[PDB]
Design a protein around this ligand. Structure first.
Ligand SMILES: [Ca+2]
Ligand SMILES: [Zn+2]
Length: 441
């Protein structure tokens, strides 16, 4: 079932009616839904708001949209480049001689072609298979429980997306008929972003500061039809970033959001000094390449272990505003609420599978073993972009030059040449194999 593609097309009809006595939401693969996004005002300060969007379920718990969501103005004029390329036209109106409908159809086909490549790689690589089995199917438990969510509900805002029908009289898509398990949502870069940006976010966050160990589905803003050049080692051998590797990087951040280990913050809601190494978060170095931490692999592994230790145990500071609540205290406090309460076997198994914990039937309580919660955090960092690049033989940064245009078109649907294959992926990262964009400035 890993990355098994549903029979779903760009033009497959959106759900307009639902009869629970003869239909299952599990069989619904094209529907109106809503997800949180950061929206920006004219000043450029962000607030989290729901946005309606049309979703395609391309595989169990994996959703894509062709909708470019309105998150405010980018603040950059059309076709200006600053490393990244900005255009308000991409997936909103005619762009590069392609209609909106053409662009949306191509975006759908291109994302499916990328996932067909990943399915072929799962069949070839135990490591890639293990990664997709985890991000596609893992149980995702968020806390605290929100709004009208019962303490024993499996599906909620952290791990499912709403199925909305239209109010017949007003035509507004605001009639919720249920929800569907969600692990991964892939959408185009929103209006506020450049068209070359790739960005992974927590799919759902409550109003408070996020808690370590509280998971959500992840949303990736990603468009495989564009990429940016990169310089080799510290020579001048230039090549194009492979979008299939860019998405694997973002989905690795994704796995960290699914477990609630991506974004450690203190009681003031700021990143603690121990989470950063000008400044780069440890979350970025462990997603990119362990070896960037130190030339000696054993020192890299030790600094990794110290970071995971603080994610797990938190840290008490002499300034209590800088203290961090760890995964162990957050998860054990959450599960300790259930001590002595009768719960369904379905909710019991959901929690057991999510955190790798056991349940004591006699005392009706979760057994929250420290070694199990440590493994939950450690397991989140089992793979990085560099490992993917070695398995797939994709060229990436080893990681401001005046070497001209940064942003390139990528012919994912093979209109120009044999550019992208479902078995081999991107057949060349050479810049002369791709079409440079032409920024006005
Ligand atoms: Ca970027
Ligand atoms: Zn990253």
């Amino acid at each position: 079932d890993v990355l098994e593609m549903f029979d779903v097309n760009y033009e497959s009809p959106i759900l307009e009616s639902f009869d629970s006595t003869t239909q299952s939401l599990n069989d619904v693969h094209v529907f109106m839904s809503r997800i949180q996004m950061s929206a920006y005002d004219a000043d450029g300060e962000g607030r989290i708001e729901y946005r309606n969007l049309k979703l395609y379920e391309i595989s169990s718990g994996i959703f894509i949209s062709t909708d470019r969501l309105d998150t405010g103005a980018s603040g950059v004029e059309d076709d200006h480049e600053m490393v990244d390329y900005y255009s308000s036209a991409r997936l909103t109106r005619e762009f590069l001689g392609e209609s909106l409908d053409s662009q949306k159809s191509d975006y759908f086909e291109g994302i499916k072609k990328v996932f067909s490549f990943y399915k072929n790689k799962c069949n070839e690589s135990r490591y890639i298979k293990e990664f997709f089995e985890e991000i596609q199917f893992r149980n995702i438990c968020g806390f605290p429980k929100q709004a009208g969510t019962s303490s024993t509900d499996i599906f909620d805002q952290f791990n499912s997306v709403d199925v909305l029908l239209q109010d017949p009289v007003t035509s507004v898509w605001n009639k919720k008929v249920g929800s569907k398990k969600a692990n991964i949502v892939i959408i185009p870069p929103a209006t506020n972003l450049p068209i070359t940006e790739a960005c992974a976010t927590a799919g759902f966050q409550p109003e408070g500061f996020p808690k370590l160990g509280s998971g959500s589905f992840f949303t990736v803003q990603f468009d495989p039809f564009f990429s940016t050049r990169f310089k080799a080692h510290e020579t001048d051998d230039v090549a194009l970033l492979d979008p299939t590797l860019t998405l694997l990087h973002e989905m690795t951040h994704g796995l960290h959001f699914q477990k609630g280990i991506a974004n450690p913050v203190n009681r003031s809601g700021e990143t603690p000094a121990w989470a950063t190494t000008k400044e780069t978060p440890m979350e970025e170095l462990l997603t990119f390449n362990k070896h960037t931490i130190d030339d000696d692999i054993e020192i890299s592994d030790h600094l990794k272990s110290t970071y995971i230790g603080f994610l797990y145990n938190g840290r008490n500071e002499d300034d209590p505003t800088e203290s961090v609540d760890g995964v162990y205290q957050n998860v054990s406090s959450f599960l300790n609420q259930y001590r002595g309460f009768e719960i369904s076997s379905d909710f019991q198994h959901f929690i057991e599978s999510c955190y790798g914990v056991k349940y004591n039937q006699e005392s009706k309580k979760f057994i929250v073993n420290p070694r199990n919660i440590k493994r939950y955090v450690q397991d989140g960092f089992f793979i990085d972009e560099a490992k993917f690049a070695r398995i797939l033989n994709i060229k990436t940064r080893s990681y401001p030059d005046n070497l001209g245009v940064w942003s390139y078109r990528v012919d994912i649907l093979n209109r120009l040449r044999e550019t992208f294959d479902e078995d081999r992926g991107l057949l060349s990262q050479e810049l002369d194999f791709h079409t440079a964009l032409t920024p006005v400035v």
